[PDB]
């Protein structure tokens, strides 16, 4: 699944990221919404303007979930069973949008972290985000 070198690189990258997680998540949400307008149909009760309180809160929640996933990288299903059930049974989201969100997150962390965004960190983050999306898109139990 993941090599120890990849795990160490991902842990170091997220440790460097630190407490800017909420702002990074909000920026990723804004980038996705502007870039791909076909994914705005999943949020019909939101006010998708710039600098929105609800968008900022959702970005903070996504960032906290990602931080927990990093802290439990070897136990993704046990950590995210509730999220998987909610995203697969209730929302019923196709797995295409997870690729767009992962790419937007990669761009967001690349723009503000030029020193730590080496090719090895790029590959490790790509594989880690792919694994997280794969775990989240499943129908088990």
């Amino acid at each position: 699944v993941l090599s120890p070198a990849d795990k160490t690189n991902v842990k170091a990258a997220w440790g460097k990221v630190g407490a800017h997680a909420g702002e990074y998540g909000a920026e990723a949400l804004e980038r996705m919404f502007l870039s791909f307008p076909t994914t705005k149909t999943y949020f019909p009760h939101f006010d998708l303007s710039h600098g929105s309180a609800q968008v900022k809160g959702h970005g903070k929640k996504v960032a906290d979930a990602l931080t927990n996933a990093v802290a439990h990288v070897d136990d993704m299903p046990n950590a995210l069973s509730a999220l998987s059930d909610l995203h697969a049974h209730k929302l019923r989201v196709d797995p295409v949008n997870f690729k767009l969100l992962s790419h937007c997150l990669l761009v967001t962390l690349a723009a503000h972290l030029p020193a730590e965004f080496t090719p090895a960190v790029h590959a490790s983050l790509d594989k880690f985000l792919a694994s997280v999306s794969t775990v989240l898109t499943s129908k088990y139990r």
């Binding site: 761009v107 723009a111 503000h112």
Partner: protein
């Protein structure tokens, strides 16, 4: 695809600010390192066992120069892209036998490298405009496959 005058001005300004030497090399090296199966076509370039050697290979940069020149020509001719990307499309379809996923992968890697180089100047509107441009170029270059 059509672009607004403000988006056109922004993309022209940033492209004028782009360094025209290392961007293509970085894009090619990052593609090869991140997606390893893409070496099945570039195995003739020499040693590619480690990312250090992949980035230090001179032929990688010598080919990234041509790749970025082709991208620059395509960006210059936005109104008519099918006419411009004809010989390259025929070559890729006939000799190389490459499925169209690698084109969008390369476009995404190029956008990531542009963001890395330009820092905070890569605003979401400019990012969206460049996504549109790269999607159009990929679709124009891969048309005979489907």
């Amino acid at each position: 695809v059509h672009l607004t005058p403000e988006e056109k001005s922004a993309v022209t300004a940033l492209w004028g600010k782009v360094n025209v030497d290392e961007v293509g090399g970085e894009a090619l090296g990052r593609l090869l390192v991140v997606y390893p199966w893409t070496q099945r076509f570039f195995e003739s370039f020499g040693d590619l066992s480690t990312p250090d050697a992949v980035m230090g290979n001179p032929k990688v940069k010598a080919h990234g120069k041509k790749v970025l020149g082709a991208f620059s020509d395509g960006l210059a001719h936005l109104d008519n892209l099918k006419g411009t990307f004809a010989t390259l499309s025929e070559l890729h379809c006939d000799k190389l036998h490459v499925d169209p996923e690698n084109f969008r992968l390369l476009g995404n890697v190029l956008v990531c490298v542009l963001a890395h180089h330009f820092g905070k100047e890569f605003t979401p509107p400019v990012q969206a405009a460049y996504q549109k441009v790269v999607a159009g170029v990929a679709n124009a270059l891969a048309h005979k496959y489907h």
